[model samples]
Target: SFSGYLKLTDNVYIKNADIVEEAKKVKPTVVVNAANVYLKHGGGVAGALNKATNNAMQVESDDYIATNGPLKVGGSCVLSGHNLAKHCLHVVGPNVNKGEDIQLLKSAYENFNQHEVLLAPLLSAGIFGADPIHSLRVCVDTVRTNVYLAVFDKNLYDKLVSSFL
Candidate 1:
């Protein structure tokens, strides 16, 4: 769908689109995947990105953990884009269902600062179950990159857009 783009400021955008398709076409410098602390690319954005990359992202993530050990919540790992986009940045957010603090989600967004062109989804908003509006707020405020927030669900799209209005 990739059409509705709500401009948030000079460099950021909120998009109602599939991150997978957006990465394929827009091809930003980096695509952010909401990762678990283990860096497993097995579900949600991580899973989709892993599938798209032919499990190559998972392979690199495994190697990263092998060398650097598992990442802590709010920590990060980077992987080559495997031809879809230029790169992929895996960031860990909290599993709120387990009573993890929202600050972990905030930390995840803060880590995205400094990239020139990045694409991200709402941190911890999928199976991890964080509030979408809260995730959007933290994301829009913390990330300094020229980041595009690609939101997939229609209800989420409406809610996020409503926040700006």
Candidate 2:
């Protein structure tokens, strides 16, 4: 089943659903968005989340310094003042084609102390262009919160299940 659950740890878990769907289902305290260092929520999951939340996330992004890599790989921009979640943790991962940074990905997870239920995508996938399986692996292995990984792509979902199982 594409919409299924896997318990990866005592506090961490993996879930498959549309990102938007999982956001509503989980009502997480923190919504992790994999963004570029530029802080532009223009496309991919970031765009969808920004739109779904009525451009509220983007409004929050303006507060942070949108440098070339201001937050760096593991750095984050905390989007506040949105009902989307208590806060939206925007992490800019290194481009996969250039070089995959596992430590940065782990650092993003490290900043997730405010929430018990955190909803995130497979970071570094999509626009960041990292392998979904590998990205998922990093997240599943690093996250300490009860994470619901929203997998909108069926192929990615299947890959995640096959690899993990």
Candidate 3:
């Protein structure tokens, strides 16, 4: 199965696996996508899931941006993930507000609250540039026990496992 799991404080169950695949297993009503304000699906997790769903994510994202404009830093926008998920919450990590980063970053993942089962990546920790470990912490802290984090990197997933022990 190639999966690792940790039950961090608050009982958030983080697991090492593909985010898209994890979503499928849990039948997630919503999944989180790390995205830029422009919501371009060029690469990373975004590109992979977009390809899996046959470009519906990008098409729907472009449609949202065209109508509603770009997402602000730490902003969340919901769009249908077609077959991949019922809905996707796309968030841009905060860049401008140093003092507000923690609060704003927490706010980004707060969108996960609306779902029955949430499958999300460790939001804003990589390309968004928050400290990876700290981002892992917020993901643990912000959601309910039903949260399932997809930690793709072995090293980072190692950190996640170690922190709980």
Candidate 4:
């Protein structure tokens, strides 16, 4: 699992899941059209560290492990894998006063709308601690497209997103 885990120095929110799913389900969109993807969620602040710790705790509860980029909590977005897809981009939405969130989302639409498939993992998107609810609103207002929720835990995912602004 550790070997499979892809670590990014930046926290990321992707506009498309197919990119991730493609690697999982469809054996390298360039190779074969496979279905069903393996999904893994990251911890919030010490996401990478927490993931490593959690993995470690499953058996041995201690020791020194490798650390990468100090677990970027709230700076950028990351895509963890080696696939020749689109260039993974990172954006720290503008400050509230500058309307950064809104503009960043707009940029998302403009940038990735051309793709036939998309996978938006908002939960993991470290939008600089932007209000989740307001983020949902931004999603609705800007995208206005059908979104399929591919959460691993429905109960928890629901509880977390019940009041999406």
Cα RMSD of all models vs. native, in order, equals 2.0, 3.4, 3.2, 12.4
User: Residues 34-100, candidate 2, lDDT per residue (tens digit)?
Assistant: 7777677898888888888888777667656543335677667667626566777887776676675
Predicted model with the maximum TM-score: 1
Clashes, model 3: 0
Lowest summed lDDT across 10 adjacent residues in model 3 is found at 94-103
Clashing pairs in model 2, backbone N/Cα/C closer than 3 A: none
Task: Flag regions of model 4 displaced more than 4 Å.
Answer: 1-92, 95-103, 123-127, 144-156
**TM-scores of the models, in the order given:** 0.92, 0.82, 0.83, 0.37
Which runs of model 3 end up more than 4 angstroms from their true locations?
Answer: 1-4, 95-103
lDDT of 4 at 100: 40
Ranking by TM-score: 1, 3, 2, 4
Q: Give the better candidate number (1 or 3) by TM-score.
A: 1
Candidate structures ordered by lDDT, highest first: 1, 3, 2, 4
Clashing pairs in 3: none
Per-residue lDDT over 1-165 for candidate 4, one digit per residue giving the tens place of the 0 to 100 score: 011222121222222232344334433212111110111223332233224334432121122112222212123333322242232222233234334444454444332233333333442224234444454455455543332322233453454355433
Q: At residue 21, give the lDDT of candidate 4.
A: 45
TM-score of 4: 0.37
Compared with the true structure, what per-residue lDDT tens digits does model 1 show for residues 15-117? 8888888888877778888888788877788888889888988888888889989888887877787756788888888889777887888788877885677
The sequence of per-residue lDDT tens digits that candidate 3 reaches over residues 1-165 is: 213556676647777788877766655777788877888977767887787778889999999999999987677888886877778888676643233365677877676776766677877765556776877777767766467678888788888688654
The lDDT values for all models are 0.81, 0.71, 0.73, 0.31
Candidates 2 and 4, the one with greater lDDT? 2
